[PDB]
Design a protein around this ligand. Sequence first.
Ligand SMILES: O=P(O)(O)OC[C@H]1O[C@@H](O)[C@H](O)[C@@H](O)[C@@H]1O
Ligand SMILES: [Mg+2]
Ligand code: NA
Length: 219
Amino acid sequence: MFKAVLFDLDGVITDTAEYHFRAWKALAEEIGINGVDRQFNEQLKGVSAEDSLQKILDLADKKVSAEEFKELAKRKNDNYVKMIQDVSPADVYPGILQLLKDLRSNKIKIALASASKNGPFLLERMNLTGYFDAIADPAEVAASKPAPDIFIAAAHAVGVAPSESIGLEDSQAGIQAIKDSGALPIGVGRPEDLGDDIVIVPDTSHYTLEFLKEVWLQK
Ligand SMILES: O=P(O)(O)OC[C@H]1O[C@@H](O)[C@H](O)[C@@H](O)[C@@H]1O
Ligand SMILES: [Mg+2]
Ligand code: NA
């Protein structure tokens, strides 16, 4: 039996992947880059703020000064942080609160493996902080998604091996990070985006302890 679940936040616990997308798209268009559509945004999910901006600049073969890079990243963050102020417990995705309760009842550790610096604030907005045994700080890892470091850190922070853990993710980069950590990935989203080679559920209501159990036994 698995001993921990390692949660991504954005697009898994709540619909904040939508807000990252909207904020990055707005930023890109301000600097004359029009290619950040939903399809391109699949390459941005799960990756750090710096890597997101660089991927956007690369899309247009654009070069900015170091000073401008810092300002642009700050501008997007300030916008994103204003978007999320009204997030509340009502915004928790279906099934997620119940899963957290069921994991705790069964003495399964719960850790956050979000690349987002805004992760702790969002857990507070959603009254979820008390369910988490650990939050892996994305600033403390040497390498960000799709490197496995944040999932390894999350598992270690709750005293469990990655190989005894399940990771929940909505992103290509994050699934790869889970795979390379040794944990078992279960994605949420469209097969057209996350791959046909792992277990994928179409929506978070499918993330039941029953199903994680159904899944684990068969790995
Ligand atoms: O800019 P932040 O809040 O640190 O977020 C970093 C990344 O956090 C991840 O959780 C999101 O999937 C990415 O879209 C985002 O870029
Ligand atoms: Mg995500
Ligand atoms: Na709160």
